[PDB]
Assembly symmetry: C11
Homo-oligomer: 69 residues x 11
């Protein structure tokens, strides 16, 4: 099942999982401080992932950076 790579470039980065199914909501928010990496998969409970803050992200489609503020 796919996964995404997130590296925080700053303190307080947020990787939020949104619930799978009929409803759409935040079920979990993982805080990442500067330099930490989170490797997260799409699962039965998570069908969309939002990154808040400055981070460096890798997926099967390539590299992208979110930006804070």
């Amino acid at each position: 099942s796919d996964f995404v790579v997130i590296k925080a470039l700053e303190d307080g980065v947020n990787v939020i999982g949104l619930t799978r199914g009929a409803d759409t909501r935040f079920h979990h928010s993982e805080k990442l401080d500067k330099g930490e990496v989170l490797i997260a998969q799409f699962t039965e409970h998570t069908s969309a992932i939002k990154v808040r803050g400055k981070a460096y992200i890798q997926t099967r489609h390539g590299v992208i950076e979110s930006e804070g503020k």
Copy 2:
């Protein structure tokens, strides 16, 4: 199942899911602000995705820029 990456290039971008099945309507609209990144899958509930607002998008098939009015 496949997924799309959307980076908001401006405030208030909308990432909108359209219902799977015989009936077709928007079931959810995730608002993104400038620099935030949304990674979203095609699921049991979502069979088409619409982006409104200025964003940068990556999919299996290439990259695309959406633009606001």
Copy 3:
């Protein structure tokens, strides 16, 4: 299952779904304003999709523009 990417290159583009089965009719028409992106899959209800209006399109087989007059 596969999807197509459509960017409207003018207001009023139409993205139309053709019914899966022994009959073929339009069951849905999604309207796109200039700059808006629709990412759409081939589903249990849709086995053919028709684009009307000027649009930039990307599929698994490459890019193509649609032109209407």
Copy 4:
């Protein structure tokens, strides 16, 4: 399941599907005007597709233009 992309290079192109099974006949004819794009799959009901008129076509095996 595979699909074909068809862009009408003139008014009145026809995208015709042929019925899957022991019988072969046309079951449907989608007409395209100039510039319009049809993206169509192979289905439980369609196992062959015929395009008539001038069109620009894309498949897994490459590009091809039809001429009426």
Copy 5:
């Protein structure tokens, strides 16, 4: 399931389907006029396809012209 692309480069091309199973015969023949394209699959009823006439042919294995 695999398919073939056939463009007729003259009138009267004929794309013939041969039956699947223990017996082998033509079960259909689709004529093509100059410039017409047929995109056809291998199916529960068709395990072999024969092209007669002048045609520009595309498959998984490459391009081929029939003469």
Copy 6:
């Protein structure tokens, strides 16, 4: 299933299908005339194909000419 492209570069080319199973015998022989193309599969009834005559052949593994 996989298939084989066979174009005849002379008259009388023969595409022979051999039986799948514990016994091995030809069960069908499709005759090709110069220029014709035959696109056939491996199937429940055919597990080896033999080509007699001069032909241009394409498979998953590449081109190859037969001489007969």
Copy 7:
């Protein structure tokens, strides 16, 4: 089923497993010391992996170095 390659570049790196399911919490931390390599999969119990401290990571998507503190 996918896996991640982790090499500690300093002592006291932790590779943390996040539980699969409606709840999300750390169920395990593997300590790595400088030069040690952990090769770990996504599983029935782990659906997200967090690396603390300096490490050199290889996944299907390429290379990345963690630099988190402590």
Copy 8:
């Protein structure tokens, strides 16, 4: 399921099929004359194939000549 392409470089080439299962023994030998091509598959009955004669062979793994 896979196959091998075998072209006879001389008369009398022989493509032999060895049985699948606990016993190994040849169950067929298709003779090929100079120029003839045999396209054959690994099947329920064949788990190994021996070529005797001068043949040009094509597999998933590349080309090889038998001598």
Copy 9:
């Protein structure tokens, strides 16, 4: 299923398999002497591999040296 290649560069390398399940603990420790190669898979019992000592490692994502 996936595997890793481990070449010991020094006597005493220790290849540790960690338990698949809710609990994580080493279930086996395989020691290698300098120059030996262990080729190991992920399996129903092993979901994580830990490598102590100086070794040369090959996986699907590339090469890496434990130190």
Copy 10:
């Protein structure tokens, strides 16, 4: 299911099959003479293959010569 290509490079080359299962023993040894090709699969009966003699070998992992 995968296979390997074995070309004998001298008379008396030997292709040995090892049993699948808890026990491991040879259950068949197919002798090849100079220039002959054997194309063999991993099967329900064979989980490992040993080559004895001077042989040219192609697998999915590349070419190798036995000595």
Copy 11:
């Protein structure tokens, strides 16, 4: 499953199979003499293979050499 390719580069090369299961023990040791090639699979009974001796190894992930 996948397989490894092992060629003995000296006499007495030992290819050891480790048991699949909750327990991990050697269940077999194939002895290889210089020049002999053993091509082995991961199986129902083998989940990990050890090579002792100077041997030339090919896997999906490339070549590697064990040294005696």
